Amino acid sequence: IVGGYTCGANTVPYQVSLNSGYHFCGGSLINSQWVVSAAHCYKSGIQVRLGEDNINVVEGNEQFISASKSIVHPSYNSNTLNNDIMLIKLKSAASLNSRVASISLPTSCASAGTQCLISGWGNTKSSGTSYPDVLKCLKAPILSDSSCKSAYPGQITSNMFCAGYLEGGKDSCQGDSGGPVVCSGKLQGIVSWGSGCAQKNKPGVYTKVCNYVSWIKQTIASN
Ligand SMILES: N=C(N)c1ccc(CNC(=O)[C@@H]2CCCN2C(=O)CNC2CCCCC2)cc1
Ligand SMILES: [Ca+2]
């Protein structure tokens, strides 16, 4: 997160860190046994870390649970990042509490101008690299269709939206991938891609979760 702020410990209780001996992606807890992340975050050997603030210190409140299943959308395209969504089933259910909590799926898509909360342990610099220990947050609005497509012509599918700031300075970034975009208490986006980070006229691009609510429920119900 570039241009954001320290969230505060466990203020984003649905935020998870995906770990492979290091933090490599974010995710969102949507019930005690399932996480939503980016298909481009797929790999073997995923450990889900819930309840985290400082990812480099065992502080209390952490739950480390191995992934049992990682289900990449069958129509994911690694070139266009269309359908950049993955469901991870935990080997055991998490213990839900004030610091480890699920986030609701949307009942409808969000509209342009809606303010949302984006969070993660990704890069905090727009030119170079600095990775934080504690969770970072950013308030960011959803952009209009036309503005999104003007920023990224021929690259925005119906399964993507733009959010952020055309003036630069405030954005998600590498390491935030798979993490939440939450708007009015609903999980509307997944950190997916962009051109650079926090660059002028190049806002972030997010997986449009409202298009996958039925896929998610059907897939979880059958697994
Ligand atoms: N909101 C941002 N600006 C942002 C950007 C990137 C990421 C992480 N996602 C990624 O890195 C995804 C994986 C496949 C390649 N990809 C990219 O985003 C491609 N980024 C380049 C495209 C051409 C212009 C230079 C930058 C997360 C957020
Ligand atoms: Ca910790």
**Residue 170, domain CATH:** 2.40.10.10
User: Are residues 146 and 48 both part of a single domain?
Assistant: no
Q: How far is the CA of 50 from the centre of ligand 2 (A)?
A: 9
Q: 38 near 192, Cβ under 8 Å?
A: yes
149 contact partners, CB below 8 Å, separation of at least 6: 156
150 contact partners, CB below 8 Å, separation of at least 6: none
User: Are residues 8 and 32 both part of a single domain?
Assistant: no
d(CA 52, CA 89): 18
The per-residue DSSP string of 164-210 comes to S-TTSS-B--TT-TT-EEEETTEEEEEEEE-SSSSBTTB-EEEEEGG
d(CA 21, CA 18): 9
User: Are residues 18 and 112 both part of a single domain?
Assistant: no
User: Are residues 146 and 73 both part of a single domain?
Assistant: no
Q: Which residue carries 């999104």 as its tokens?
A: 148
At residue 62's C-alpha, the angle toward residues 49 and 9, to 5°, is 100
Beta strands, E only, the chain? 5-6, 15-19, 23-31, 34-37, 47-50, 63-72, 86-90, 115-120, 136-141, 160-163, 180-183, 186-193, 204-208
C-alpha distances out from residue 111 to 118, 183, 188, 189, Å: 16, 10, 10, 12
- The method of structure determination was X-ray
User: Are residues 68 and 110 both part of a single domain?
Assistant: no
Neighbours of 150 (CB within 10 A): 14
d(CA 17, CA 9): 14
Ligand 1 atom with least separation from CA of 81? 14
Report the pocket of ligand 1 as residue ranges, CB < 6 Å.
Answer: 40, 171-174, 176-177, 191, 193-197, 204
User: Are residues 109 and 202 both part of a single domain?
Assistant: yes
Nearest Cα to 203, choosing from 149, 132, 122? 149
User: Are residues 200 and 109 both part of a single domain?
Assistant: yes
User: Are residues 8 and 110 both part of a single domain?
Assistant: yes
Three-state DSSP at 216 gives helix
Domain that holds residue 96: 13-103+211-223
Report residue 210 CA to chain centroid gap.
14
User: Are residues 167 and 137 both part of a single domain?
Assistant: yes
Specify binding-site residues for Ca(2+).
52, 54, 57, 62
Phi/psi for 35 (5° steps) reads: -120, 145
The 186-193 sheet, strands edge to edge: 5-6, 136-141, 115-120, 180-183, 186-193, 204-208, 160-163
User: Are residues 22 and 84 both part of a single domain?
Assistant: yes
Q: What are 32's two structure tokens?
A: 């005690």
User: Are residues 204 and 116 both part of a single domain?
Assistant: yes
Q: What are 46's two structure tokens?
A: 């995923």
Q: How far is the CA of 144 from the centre of ligand 2 (A)?
A: 37
Query: How many domains, in total, are found in the chain?
Result: 2
d(CA 138, CA 202): 16
User: Are residues 110 and 2 both part of a single domain?
Assistant: yes
